[PDB]
Symmetry: D2
Subunit: 114 residues, 4 copies
Amino acid sequence: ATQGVFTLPANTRFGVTAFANSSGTQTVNVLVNNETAATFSGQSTNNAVIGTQVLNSGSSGKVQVQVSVNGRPSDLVSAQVILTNELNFALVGSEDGTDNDYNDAVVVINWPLG
Amino acid sequence: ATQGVFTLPANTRFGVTAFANSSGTQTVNVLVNNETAATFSGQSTNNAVIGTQVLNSGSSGKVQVQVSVNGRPSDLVSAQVILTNELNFALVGSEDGTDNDYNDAVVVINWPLG
Amino acid sequence: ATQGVFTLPANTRFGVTAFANSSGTQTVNVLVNNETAATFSGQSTNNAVIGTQVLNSGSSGKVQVQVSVNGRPSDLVSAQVILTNELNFALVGSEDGTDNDYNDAVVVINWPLG
Amino acid sequence: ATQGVFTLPANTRFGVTAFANSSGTQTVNVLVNNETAATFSGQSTNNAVIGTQVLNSGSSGKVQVQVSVNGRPSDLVSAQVILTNELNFALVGSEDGTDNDYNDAVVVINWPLG
Ligand SMILES: [Ca+2]
Ligand SMILES: [Ca+2]
Ligand SMILES: [Ca+2]
Ligand SMILES: [Ca+2]
Ligand SMILES: [Ca+2]
Ligand SMILES: [Ca+2]
Ligand SMILES: [Ca+2]
Ligand SMILES: [Ca+2]
């Protein structure tokens, strides 16, 4: 099934943050309405927050997270969770190898902000 | 119901990161095995990371997050999500006022690391 | 924080199912647009389905689950999870006692339907 | 990534419930310790509960959900969510066609019981 794609409320600012846990250099692309809006990269086996940024969901509210290592797309897992019908978390995990820990690149999207 | 309490596998490394979205300075205490193991303090209304660290779950694996603003405990909401039966997210949202956006202090705990 | 309240897309069909795990008779009230749309009542300590039905979120899409035992409101825990950005689960757990297993009345709301 | 596989605490009773929302007959298999422990088959576009039973996780605690339509395996999506660090939901969605709603056969596993 498709993973890493989330529908946020339109024209809403959200935070996107990436974590690295791999010996390979991670590259995270965040697309809004099918267009890259932010890219983060880094190499850490100690959960370094390789990047964070505030984006606007735009008119479509469509957000997609892509993870690649040296140009090679990683296998993704994701889900969205809503707490007290207000706080939203869109989560993504990724595997760039076969040890299957799926934390090589971890991305958390949260909203609302402010 | 109790919130902000998670049972992680014992003696395991996990990451804890806090984001702030409030006019008030957020104080995030992380207790492991019933003893404070880390504390983050910061202020932001733009989802800035006010702290991130790697900790160990201790002998019981019990990890608790508490949030307060100038001594006043914030109401918490939380949940744990597991993807592909191995990637874990312990999530916490908190409210320091009455607008109930529960993002004043957002905390993400993730494991495994490395 | 408020629990058991979910905002579904307006005028959408959804399923609601209640399970019981308590010595006490569980009374589950499902409100739509702040009005009772269905009530399930039964007793079971073996996860028996005390009710399942197809409802409509109505104009507002506001859905709320209330659980009471002998008239006394049970404490609730809840969250919404969305898989592959299409499959939604509105989950509710309730506690009518002190053992805090929060399964005394378990309610699962799912959409979209077929 | 692998989906529909869950690790529950060993020798623990859990509930497994399947809903149907497809034009095709859904075949849901629940394997405990790599052995078929329950099977539900049915057709419904209105969330009929085609099956709900209480099973024991066995010595391994490994539980797997498989869904097929007339011998053809459906693609699965899944996740586990834990509320108040006590109530567990193992969620599964399945897709038999081309409308990516993954609600053709929906399975919910919950524990603890009683
Ligand atoms: Ca890996
Ligand atoms: Ca890794
Ligand atoms: Ca607030
Ligand atoms: Ca706020
Ligand atoms: Ca109870
Ligand atoms: Ca109970
Ligand atoms: Ca379908
Ligand atoms: Ca369907």
